[PDB]
Design an enzyme around this catalytic site. Structure first.
Site, PDB file in Angstrom:
ATOM      1  N   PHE A  86       2.021  10.841   0.874  1.00  0.00           N
ATOM      2  CA  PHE A  86       1.559  10.364   2.180  1.00  0.00           C
ATOM      3  C   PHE A  86       2.583   9.395   2.792  1.00  0.00           C
ATOM      4  CE2 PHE A  86      -1.956   7.686   4.459  1.00  0.00           C
ATOM      5  CZ  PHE A  86      -1.491   8.095   5.696  1.00  0.00           C
ATOM      6  N   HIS A 100      -0.594   6.266  16.001  1.00  0.00           N
ATOM      7  CA  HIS A 100       0.415   5.314  15.542  1.00  0.00           C
ATOM      8  C   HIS A 100       1.717   5.542  16.288  1.00  0.00           C
ATOM      9  CE1 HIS A 100      -1.944   3.851  12.042  1.00  0.00           C
ATOM     10  NE2 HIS A 100      -2.544   5.009  12.253  1.00  0.00           N
ATOM     11  N   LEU A 111      -1.686  11.564  12.599  1.00  0.00           N
ATOM     12  CA  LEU A 111      -1.416  10.222  13.115  1.00  0.00           C
ATOM     13  C   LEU A 111      -0.759  10.249  14.499  1.00  0.00           C
ATOM     14  CD1 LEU A 111      -0.279   8.485   9.811  1.00  0.00           C
ATOM     15  CD2 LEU A 111      -2.576   8.691  10.782  1.00  0.00           C
ATOM     16  N   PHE A 137       4.990   1.738   8.220  1.00  0.00           N
ATOM     17  CA  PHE A 137       5.043   2.675   7.114  1.00  0.00           C
ATOM     18  C   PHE A 137       6.164   3.689   7.270  1.00  0.00           C
ATOM     19  CE2 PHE A 137       2.724   6.313   9.063  1.00  0.00           C
ATOM     20  CZ  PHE A 137       2.102   5.683  10.134  1.00  0.00           C
ATOM     21  N   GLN A 142       3.683   1.733   2.825  1.00  0.00           N
ATOM     22  CA  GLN A 142       3.374   0.725   3.846  1.00  0.00           C
ATOM     23  C   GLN A 142       3.771  -0.682   3.406  1.00  0.00           C
ATOM     24  OE1 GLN A 142      -0.542   1.143   5.568  1.00  0.00           O
ATOM     25  NE2 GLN A 142      -0.629  -0.990   6.262  1.00  0.00           N
ATOM     26  N   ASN A 201      -1.561  -0.005  12.050  1.00  0.00           N
ATOM     27  CA  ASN A 201      -2.425  -0.707  12.991  1.00  0.00           C
ATOM     28  C   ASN A 201      -3.879  -0.720  12.526  1.00  0.00           C
ATOM     29  OD1 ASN A 201      -3.924   1.582  14.162  1.00  0.00           O
ATOM     30  ND2 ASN A 201      -2.012   2.143  15.199  1.00  0.00           N
ATOM     31  N   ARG A 239       0.860  -1.181   0.000  1.00  0.00           N
ATOM     32  CA  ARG A 239       0.000   0.000   0.000  1.00  0.00           C
ATOM     33  C   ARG A 239       0.895   1.229   0.000  1.00  0.00           C
ATOM     34  NH1 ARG A 239      -2.856   2.807   5.001  1.00  0.00           N
ATOM     35  NH2 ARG A 239      -4.319   4.174   3.894  1.00  0.00           N
TER      36      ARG A 239
HETATM   37  C1  LIG Z   1      -6.497  -5.807   9.655  1.00  0.00           C
HETATM   38  C2  LIG Z   1      -5.309  -6.072  10.580  1.00  0.00           C
HETATM   39  O1  LIG Z   1      -5.313  -7.060  11.313  1.00  0.00           O
HETATM   40  C3  LIG Z   1      -4.132  -5.125  10.594  1.00  0.00           C
HETATM   41  C4  LIG Z   1      -4.022  -4.063   9.660  1.00  0.00           C
HETATM   42  C5  LIG Z   1      -2.915  -3.195   9.695  1.00  0.00           C
HETATM   43  C6  LIG Z   1      -1.906  -3.370  10.653  1.00  0.00           C
HETATM   44  C7  LIG Z   1      -2.000  -4.424  11.594  1.00  0.00           C
HETATM   45  N1  LIG Z   1      -0.973  -4.614  12.583  1.00  0.00           N
HETATM   46  C8  LIG Z   1      -3.112  -5.298  11.562  1.00  0.00           C
END
Ligand SMILES: CC(=O)c1cccc(N)c1
Length: 164
Positions: free
Chosen positions: A59, A125, A121, A112, A62, A101, A54
């Site tokens: 921005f 985060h 954020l 990221f 990730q 997260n 992603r």
């Molecule tokens: C959907 C999920 O479990 C998820 C998504 C982004 C980062 C993290 N640590 C977990």
């Protein structure tokens, strides 16, 4: 001192170079240690071979879902998820390294690298490091993103590890 780690990144099977990251173990030791060990692969799993799935221009980039490769997965060295350690470090500008997260206390392995200041954020985060070398590589990765996050090249962490 604080760990230095690296990610070597390909785009469509050709090398872009190396991103070197300082991990702020002085501030967030548990979060830094997780990322460090996932870079070395010393627990038997980690970032080697996984993707930047992603990427959104102006921005962030990730990565770190080494189980599902799509943003739903990943796991930490402690268990599937671990708490937000603190929010002491802020998303101050390009090069900030922060945990992805799915809400409070859901850190795993996804992370990221910011390409701009992302102040909204802060407090949501956990920031745990920054780019020491290789922002040129990060800007290349960024250029292969889109508004939706979908990448236009396959971006792979081919190698990773610890420098000091
Ligand atoms: C959907 C999920 O479990 C998820 C998504 C982004 C980062 C993290 N640590 C977990």
């Amino acid at each position: 001192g604080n760990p230095l780690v690296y990610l070597d990144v390909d785009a469509n099977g050709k090398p872009l170079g190396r991103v070197v990251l300082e991990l702020k173990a002085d501030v967030v030791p548990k979060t830094a240690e997780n990322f460090r060990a996932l870079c070395t692969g010393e627990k038997g799993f980690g970032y080697k071979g996984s993707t930047f799935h992603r990427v959104i221009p102006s921005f962030m980039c990730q990565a770190g879902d080494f189980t599902n490769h799509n943003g739903t997965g990943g796991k930490s060295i402690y268990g599937s998820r671990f708490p937000d350690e603190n929010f002491t470090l802020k998303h101050v500008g390009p090069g900030v390294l922060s945990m992805a997260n799915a809400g409070p206390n859901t850190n795993g392995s996804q992370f990221f690298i910011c390409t701009i200041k992302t102040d909204w954020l802060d407090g949501k985060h956990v920031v745990f490091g920054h780019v020491i070398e290789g922002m040129d590589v990060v800007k290349k990765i960024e250029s292969f993103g889109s508004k939706s996050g979908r990448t236009s090249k396959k971006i792979v962490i081919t190698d990773c590890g610890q420098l000091s």
